[PDB]
């Protein structure tokens, strides 16, 4: 009854960071063993936990979070960071205990002339509270006067494409991003190593 | 993906025509779709640009007033109503799509768009 990573892990498409996507992983036995032994990850930083002591603990809850960005905004994926994606697209909390897992993608995500399909927030009103998701698309007011949904002076819209060219120096070709949460509520702990 | 252009052709000065481009074949996304025209001998100028999401408008100087660039999602059509045709709107005119997302609008009247209609001829007489 193996936990189904690999639907998160070998996706053939990833999403935007602004509309991040979430796995439930429940009711199943995790071998986290394919994870920390892969060749394939350029990150992979667990928070107070190590992949070896989640093979004899259970959780009622694992979550799978996943997206792309760029490489030199990996470093913004863990806790008590600032910067455009953890403050308005994707925010861990300053007390996370999960795993943060990252690899270049540029095989995948960018093509010749540029792949323009990933977006990132680069407006908004306040910041992210952590695991909250933003998928508005209303005109950004950048001044005093309202934008009422319509773009001009001083009004946004508060999307942006990524320039994912393969040609793109590292810092700029794109990254997929899983970040594991684990969970245990007083309802039972489902989710065990083998 | 392929943009497929309608409507237009002889229309006398003062008239009003509407263009069509409709967009088909498997698109992941669409940014924006705009207008450009080219005259005998002149360069391929921007006519208008509409945002696919919220549908915001932008307008070269010489067709505000004049022109409305609009869309229909569910049809993936793009519109250009000429309305007030003068002699200098005389061109073959191109629908363009991209899938390039700027925060800015004003950005579609000079990006290089991806994909370019086969042009439509409009011709305004006396």
């Known amino acids: 009854n193996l936990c189904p990573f690999g639907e998160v892990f070998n996706a053939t498409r990833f999403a935007s960071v602004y509309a991040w996507n979430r796995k439930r992983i429940s009711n199943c036995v995790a071998d986290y063993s394919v994870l920390y032994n892969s060749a394939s990850f350029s990150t992979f930083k667990c928070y107070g936990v190590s992949p070896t002591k989640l093979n004899d603990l259970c959780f009622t809850n694992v979550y799978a979070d996943s997206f792309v960005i760029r490489g030199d905004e990996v470093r913004q994926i863990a806790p008590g960071q600032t910067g455009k994606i953890a403050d308005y697209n994707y925010k861990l909390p300053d007390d996370f205990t999960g795993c943060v897992i990252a690899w270049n993608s540029n095989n995948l995500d960018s093509k010749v002339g540029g792949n323009y399909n990933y977006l990132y927030r680069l407006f908004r009103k306040s910041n992210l509270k952590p695991f909250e998701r933003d998928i508005s698309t209303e005109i950004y007011q950048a001044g005093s006067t309202p934008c009422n949904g319509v773009e001009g002076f001083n009004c946004y819209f508060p999307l942006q494409s990524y320039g994912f060219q393969p040609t793109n120096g590292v810092g700029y070709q794109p990254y997929r991003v899983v970040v594991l949460s684990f969970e245990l509520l007083h309802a039972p702990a489902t989710v065990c190593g083998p | 993906v392929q943009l497929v252009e309608s409507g237009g052709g002889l229309m006398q000065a003062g008239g009003s025509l509407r263009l069509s481009c409709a967009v088909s074949?498997?698109?992941?996304?669409?940014?924006?779709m705009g207008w450009f025209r080219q005259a005998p001998g002149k360069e391929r100028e921007f006519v208008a640009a509409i945002r696919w999401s919220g549908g915001s408008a932008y307008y070269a100087d010489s067709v505000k007033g004049r022109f409305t660039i609009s869309r229909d999602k569910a049809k993936n059509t793009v519109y250009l109503q000429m309305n007030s045709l003068k002699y200098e709107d005389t061109a073959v005119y191109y629908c363009?799509?991209?899938?390039?997302?700027?925060?800015?609008?004003?950005?579609?009247?000079?990006?290089?768009?991806?994909?370019w209609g086969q042009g439509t001829q409009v011709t305004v007489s006396s």
């Open positions: 074949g498997r698109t992941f996304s669409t940014a924006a």
């Open positions: 363009a799509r991209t899938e390039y997302v700027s925060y800015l609008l004003s950005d579609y009247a000079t990006w290089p768009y991806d994909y």
